[PDB]
Symmetry: D2
Subunit: 99 residues, 4 copies
Amino acid sequence: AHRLSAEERDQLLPNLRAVGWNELEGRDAIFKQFHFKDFNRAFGFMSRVALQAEKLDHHPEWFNVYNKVHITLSTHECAGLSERDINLASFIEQVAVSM
Amino acid sequence: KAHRLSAEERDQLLPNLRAVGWNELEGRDAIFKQFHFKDFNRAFGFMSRVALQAEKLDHHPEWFNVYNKVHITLSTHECAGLSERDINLASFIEQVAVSM
Amino acid sequence: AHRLSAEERDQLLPNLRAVGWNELEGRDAIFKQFHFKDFNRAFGFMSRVALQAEKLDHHPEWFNVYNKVHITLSTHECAGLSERDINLASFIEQVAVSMT
Amino acid sequence: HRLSAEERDQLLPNLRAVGWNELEGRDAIFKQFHFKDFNRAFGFMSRVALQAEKLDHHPEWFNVYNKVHITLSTHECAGLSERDINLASFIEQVAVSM
């Protein structure tokens, strides 16, 4: 795991920011809030992300209350954003649009 | 109190489901439909949403899963046959499937 | 439907406080942090609690990071602690046991 | 690769001891699991589902309320492989908890 270089960030983050992801101030990580119609959808969303988290062995820092899911992503190994976060974020977006 | 569907309600509620892929099970008063997804992640996400609803309604599917495929059979044990509960759960299952 | 009285709180929170649940200070709700060996167990735990949440139509406020799950419980309908919270927390403890 | 006669003798006994049996007419092992309710049955399935994705090896399973029937085999080698023994071992670990 290697923190994204300034060149990678300018190339990989814009598409994520365009759909709601934003970097945190005092931390090298990205965050996004998701709002579904109900819990059935929110948890179904979480279930699919959970499966991928185990496949990639990269887990989200997330909060849920009924239909809301807030997600923060960062790589512990390299203490900051890495391709893992970009990959999981992209996967998360794929799941979300179906919800 | 669950009660099996009469001939009238079957002719009014089943055609709608047949029109979307559900068939009546041969040799048993139940309906079934095979779902195919791109992968297991999708198939299990599908199962998770149906499972939540199953507990909400206290009506469970008889299903078989192998990677990206999920085969579902619906029937009501209480009345040994199809009831409005199966029609309702099938409708919900359809909603979730279409989203994927 | 209704917020717990003083008596109910004294008679219903013991088994819960004894296992780590504590009432928040700025709001009428109880909180507890759960720690599992890994995410597989942590999410398995969440999956069982999620099913019961839909069965009871009472959902938790929870934060998860790998093997840790922080849970806060309160009833929106009555703006505070109700038996729905006592019941779900009790169920949560039962599930936590099955998760190592 | 498909398990050899020797590997099966070294890896199946422990599983057969807890209820796993080889299918007749197909190179695969299967076991019926019974839980108190669906909440437990599906919780069990979710933990197994997570591991299935982590290992990229999936079970052939049937569920009806509190019952879960699992069949394991490896498509790639048309039969039992170490992947089946490993997943079955993980499944056992989860089941003893429910």
